[PDB]
Structure 1
Amino acid sequence: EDTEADVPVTYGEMVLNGANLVTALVMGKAVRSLDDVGRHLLDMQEE
């Protein structure tokens, strides 16, 4: 028994905050973390 105590965490949540509210409704698809993926896709082509 290395110790008798451990370090867990709490829930991380995933809510339709911004653009995912439009894309779920105006479009169909609602790809997760589209606030970050859209930021990464708009950073690559302009160099």
Structure 2
Amino acid sequence: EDTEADVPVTYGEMVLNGANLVTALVMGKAVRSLDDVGRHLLDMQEE
């Protein structure tokens, strides 16, 4: 026995909100954290 005790956590979560909602019902697709992916792709060509 290391220990009868432990430290569990609570459920994650996600939704289609800002740009994920638009594309889902317009382009028909969606991505985890499109805001992030979008920020990092655009910024990446600004160095």
TM range (shorter): 0.7 to 0.9
Residue deviations 1:6-34 (CA, integer Å, cap 9, x gap) = 11110010111211000001111111210
SS at match of 1:15: coil
CA RMSD between the two structures: 0.9
TM-score (norm 2): 0.86
Residues in 1 aligned to 2:39 and 2:4: alpha-carbon distance in whole angstroms:
43
Whichever structure has more helix as a proportion of its residues is 2
2:42 is the counterpart of 1:46: no
Which structure 2 segments of 5+ residues have no match?
none
Number of residue-to-residue matches in the alignment? 47
Q: Percent identity?
A: 100
Residues in 1 aligned to 2:26 and 2:39: alpha-carbon distance in whole angstroms:
20
Deviation at 1:43, TM superposition (A): 1.4
TM-score (norm 1): 0.86
